[PDB]
Design a binder for this molecule. Structure first.
Ligand code: NAG
Ligand code: CA
Lengths: 252, 109
């Protein structure tokens, strides 16, 4: 037999959804820990086995988190069968303040031309937006808001921000809203430019976006990944992102 | 072209990641890799251990050509970070994602 890990705890560094789970070795080769966890409301458990005394991941802070772990002994240790300990359990869940529906609504974001992030929402006193992603020492607040009270945010330059979880919390003073997504998936590019006839051509809009990352749509409707074969529209393709917004159409 | 290798590997990972009705590779666990330089090999050194899963046959074949050297199960040169295993279906989502990143960054090997 073996005992479960000690001090099983979920820690919030305050990164707006990025959480640590921690534990100390149990009492009494190499030792393993099987950690399961999930957001309460999910029917499936995220699973992992580690020799470390901690694990980290992004969670829905709108919801509660529950986790279970159990020491795991390899049969080399035993020199017999595989011994395992009982589940240790912990939970963590943001003390909800204010009455929900005091939580802001219609939250919408776009990463215009993979360059400038905009976030917008309707209310239900004033609102604040914070964000974070790995790299950042701590969660930052928006500077250039969009007033009308704050109902928007226009982000600074987000260096090294794509292809990793992006966290947002909308405080108030009441119920905070939490949002997570990855920038590459939320890009509305600029319409293609310099359309010419010669099979007809056109070229890449002005942006940081490479050409390989583009899918073109053409309503003269049709879809293509080359730039040849009138009006054309664009969108980031699935070699660069998972989802995407179509650019506006070009001129005839 | 030069990106063709990457292009088609990504397609594959996208396939077995939308086309996994039941848990991918019977929910088998594999060593997680540090997703950075010399990781094509780390990725193969990891998955190579999943024997009996055909759903990942292609993927592994494709990987072998990205990796200068041949890789055998139980062999860990490139895989230095070997202190955590994750389910295969997460491994490929994580891998898949990192690939898309390299593609966007125009990095093809
Ligand atoms: C709201 O959340 C931000 C980001 O987590 C935090 O820094 C701040 O302490 C909170 N502010 C209020 C007014 O609750
Ligand atoms: Ca995650």
């Amino acid at each position: 037999k073996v005992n479960p890990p000690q001090d099983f705890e979920i820690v919030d560094p305050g990164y707006l959804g990025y959480l640590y789970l921690q534990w100390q070795p149990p009492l009494s080769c190499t030792v393993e820990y099987e950690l399961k966890y999930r957001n309460i409301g999910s029917e499936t458990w995220k699973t992992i086995i580690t020799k470390n005394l901690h694990y980290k991941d992004g969670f829905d802070l709108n919801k509660g988190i529950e986790a279970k772990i159990h020491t795991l002994l390899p049969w080399q240790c035993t020199n017999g069968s595989e011994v395992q300990s009982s589940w240790a359990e912990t939970t963590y869940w943001i003390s909800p303040q204010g009455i929900p529906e005091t939580k802001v609504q219609d939250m919408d974001c776009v990463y215009y031309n993979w360059q400038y992030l905009l976030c917008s929402w309707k209310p239900g006193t004033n609102y604040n937006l914070f964000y974070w992603y790995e790299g950042l020492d701590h969660a930052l607040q928006c500077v250039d808001y969009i007033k009308a009270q704050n109902i928007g945010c226009r982000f600074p330059y987000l260096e090294a921000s794509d292809y990793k979880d992006f966290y947002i919390c909308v405080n108030g003073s009441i119920r905070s809203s939490y949002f997570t997504f990855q920038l590459q998936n939320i890009v509305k590019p600029l319409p293609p430019v310099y359309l010419t006839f010669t099979k007809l051509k056109w070229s890449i809009p002005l942006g940081p976006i490479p050409a390989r990352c583009f899918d073109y749509e053409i309503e003269i409707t049709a879809t293509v990944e080359n730039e040849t074969y009138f009006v054309v529209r664009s969108k980031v393709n699935i070699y660069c992102s998972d989802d995407g917004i179509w650019s506006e159409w070009s001129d005839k | 072209p030069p990106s063709t290798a990457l292009r088609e590997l990504i397609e594959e990972l996208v396939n077995i990641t939308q086309n996994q009705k039941a848990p991918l590779c019977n929910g088998s666990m594999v060593w997680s890799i540090n997703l950075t330089a010399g990781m094509y090999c780390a990725a193969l050194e990891s998955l190579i251990n999943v024997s009996g899963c055909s759903a990942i046959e292609k993927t592994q074949r494709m990987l072998s050509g990205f990796c200068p050297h041949k890789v055998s199960a139980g062999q860990f040169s490139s895989l230095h970070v070997r202190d955590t295993k994750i389910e295969v279906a997460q491994f490929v989502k994580d891998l898949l994602l990192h690939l898309k990143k390299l593609f966007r960054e125009g990095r093809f090997n």
